[PDB]
């Protein structure tokens, strides 16, 4: 079929380089095109991925020095824009987005991939508001040949990073993503980030360890999701709740949404 390979770039989605919304000349199918050694790793990690809650990779095209990444277009935009500042969103929406985020994170960890930059800017929504984990540019293999490798590189965004990443030379990959999912859940339910970074020098972080939940953002959050956040936002990564136990949490399994 002629012209089926021709795509028109209609608008900027992000600007590493840039991301454009591409529309097929013949079929009018919408795709996102990312124009850019972490790019070689991004393509490699993306080629491994196939899950309903992970942005689908269609392929890559190399034209000289510029790399083109063909990715699933999510028309609902970013989860970030569904969070009303200082309010959040209705608890049933947050629970559904959290279920989908757990599905995507379980999938990634199951194949030995850690995203390392989970935040609402990297959680995209399709036409039916289905959450998709986006941008594997900071992602890495933490398990290979059933052997876990401990991480040591500083990756992520300070309000979302786990405290071990700032205190320890080495750390397990999975508790780090579990923590950032708890900061995402906090943002969805309170419309604010609890601290600039998880360090004792940070007063807001010290208050949380002291269990001062009568303060913001915690006072805007119901006791059932707050009990879950008490299990996720645990400083010791070895004592922090794992995803199998998050799936057994009372609020996680609370019927809320129609
Ligand atoms: C994979 O790496 C990246 C991907 C994106 C990106 C890719 C696709 C979308 C997106 C952002 N967000 C995005 C933002 C806004 C909207 C809706 C909207 O308001 N307009 C104007 C189209 C849709 C999308 N849809 C996407 O599917 C943005 C930045 C990066 N990056 O930093 O590398």
DSSP assignment of the chain equals -TTTT-EEEEEEEE---EEEEEEETTT--EEEEEE--HHHHHHHHHHH---TTBPPEEEEEEETTEEEEEEE--TTEEGGGGSBTTTB--HHHHHHHHHHHHHHHHHHHHTTEE-S--SGGGEEE-TT--EEE---SS-EE-EETTEE--B----S-GGGS-HHHHH-SSB-HHHHHHHHHHHHHHHHHHSS-S-SSSSTTSHHHHHHHTT-TTSTTGGGS-HHHHHHHHHHS-SSTTTSPPHHHHTT-TTTT-----
Cis peptide before 217 (omega within 30 of 0): yes
244 and 181 in a common domain: yes
Query: Which domain-ending residue is among 55, 84, 113?
Result: 84
94 and 61 in a common domain: no
Pick from 186, 170, 254: nearest CA to 220: 186
Q: Which of 10, 21, 32 to mutate to test the pocket of ligand 1 (most atoms within 8 A of CB)?
A: 32
Could you list the residue range(s) of the whole structural domain that residue 144 is in? 85-258
Q: Which of 35, 124, 125, 126 to mutate to test the pocket of ligand 1 (most atoms within 8 A of CB)?
A: 124
256 and 141 in a common domain: yes
Structure resolution, Å: 2.2
Spatial separation of the C-alpha atoms in residues 70 and 98, rounded to whole Å: 26
78 and 58 in a common domain: yes
Atom of ligand 1 nearest to the CA of 36: 33
135 and 78 in a common domain: no
What CATH number corresponds to the domain at position 233? 1.10.510.10
140 and 79 in a common domain: no
Question: Would you please indicate which residues are annotated as catalytic (active-site) residues?
Answer: 117
Q: Indicate which residue's Cα is closest to atom 11 of ligand 1.
A: 13
19 and 123 in a common domain: no
Atom of ligand 1 nearest to the CA of 72: 27
Query: Which domain-ending residue is among 51, 84, 117?
Result: 84
111 and 75 in a common domain: no
What is the Å distance from ligand 1's center to 178 Cα? 23
Per the structure, the count of domains in the chain is 2
User: What technique determined this structure?
Assistant: X-ray
User: What phi and psi, each to the nearest 5 degrees, are found at residue 27?
Assistant: -85, -15
167 and 48 in a common domain: no
Query: Which domain-ending residue is among 58, 84, 110?
Result: 84
What CATH number corresponds to the domain at position 62? 3.30.200.20
89 and 20 in a common domain: no
Annotated binding site for ATP: 13-19, 34
Dihedral sign, Cα of residue 108, residue 109, residue 110, residue 113: positive
63 and 124 in a common domain: no
91 and 189 in a common domain: yes
């Amino acid at each position: 079929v002629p012209f089926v390979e021709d795509w028109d770039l209609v608008q900027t989605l992000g600007e590493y380089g840039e991301v454009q919304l591409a529309v097929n000349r013949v079929t009018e199918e919408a795709v996102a095109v990312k124009i850019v050694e972490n790019i070689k790793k991004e393509i490699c990690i993306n080629k491994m991925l196939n899950h309903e809650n992970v942005v689908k990779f269609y392929g890559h095209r190399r034209e000289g020095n510029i790399q083109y990444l063909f990715l699933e277009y999510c028309s609902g935009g970013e989860l970030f824009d569904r969070i009303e500042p200082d309010i959040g969103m209705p608890e049933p929406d947050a629970q559904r987005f959290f279920h989908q985020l757990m599905a995507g994170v379980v999938y990634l960890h199951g194949i030995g991939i850690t995203h390392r930059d989970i935040k609402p800017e990297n959680l995209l929504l399709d036409e039916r508001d289905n959450l998709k984990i986006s941008d594997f540019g900071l992602a890495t293999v933490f398990r290979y040949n059933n052997r876990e490798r401990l991480l040591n590189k500083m990756c992520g965004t300070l309000p979302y990073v786990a405290p071990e990443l700032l205190k320890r030379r080495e750390f397990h990959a999975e508790p780090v993503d579990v923590w950032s999912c708890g900061i995402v859940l906090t943002a969805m339910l309170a419309g604010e980030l609890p601290w600039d970074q998880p360090s004792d020098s940070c007063q807001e972080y010290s208050d949380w360890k002291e269990k001062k939940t009568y303060l913001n953002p915690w006072k805007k959050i119901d006791s059932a999701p707050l009990a879950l956040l008490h299990k996720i936002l645990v400083e010791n990564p070895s004592a922090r709740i794992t995803i199998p136990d998050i799936k057994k949490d009372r609020w996680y399994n609370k019927p809320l949404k129609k």
